[model samples]
Target: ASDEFASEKVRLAQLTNKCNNNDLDYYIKESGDILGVTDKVKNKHDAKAILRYVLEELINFKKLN
Candidate 1:
């Protein structure tokens, strides 16, 4: 079984672990807030739309590098 936020949730977990303890909350909140996976809304763009854009850019940049 899967959920709509599965990818977002997984990515968040990875990021949370990758971030240093000095700013773990900051990294989680920053990404979650932008992705609209946070408990509260802090973005103007649709979450799905923004997530798509991010995916595209990240993939493109990684490929380029």
Candidate 2:
């Protein structure tokens, strides 16, 4: 589990760097609730898990459409 967590951190780091240059963000709302990741994720691990969740949503939407 630790090894996988570390891998997730690295994945998020690379994605976040690209997002920084591209001016990209993922804003999420579910169950009449809203949340933002901006300024909340302070480290690679944080962002990585968030990114994975974001991707899950994206894929779900794509399949729906």
Candidate 3:
């Protein structure tokens, strides 16, 4: 399961869903781990960075595929 369904709009909606459903805790955790952040707040910046990275990939994927 990859980014078959991917876009900034979709990602933003998914972020909202994650915020609402609480399942985003997993992604947050992963993002935090990837960033080696000690707190959720710190992870936020990293998460945003990750979002930027993800959006770029999605854009690239759209171009490539």
Among the numbered candidates, top lDDT falls to 1
Instruction: List, residue by residue over 11-43, the lDDT tens digit for candidate 3.
Output: 555555656445555565454444434243433
The lDDT of model 2 is 0.46
Cα TM-score of candidate 2: 0.32
User: Where does model 2 exceed 4 Å of error?
Assistant: 1-45
Per TM-score, what order, best first? 1, 3, 2
Clash pairs detected, candidate 1: none
| Alpha-carbon lDDT of model 1 | 0.61
TM-score of 3: 0.34
Instruction: Mark the 10 consecutive residues where model 2 has the least summed lDDT.
Output: 26-35
Q: Write the per-residue lDDT of candidate 1 for residues 1-65, one digit (tens) a residue.
A: 54647877787777777788776446745685636645443452455544555577679988944
**Candidate 3: clashing pairs of residues:** none
Query: What is the Cα-based lDDT of residue 19 in candidate 3?
Result: 65
Query: Candidate 2's error at 19, in angstroms?
Result: 7.8
Error of 1 at 39 (Å): 11
- Expressed as tens digits, the lDDT of each residue in 1-65 for candidate 2 is 45665665666665555554234333121100123443343442444555666577678988944
Best by TM-score: 1
Per-model TM-score versus the true fold: 0.37, 0.32, 0.34
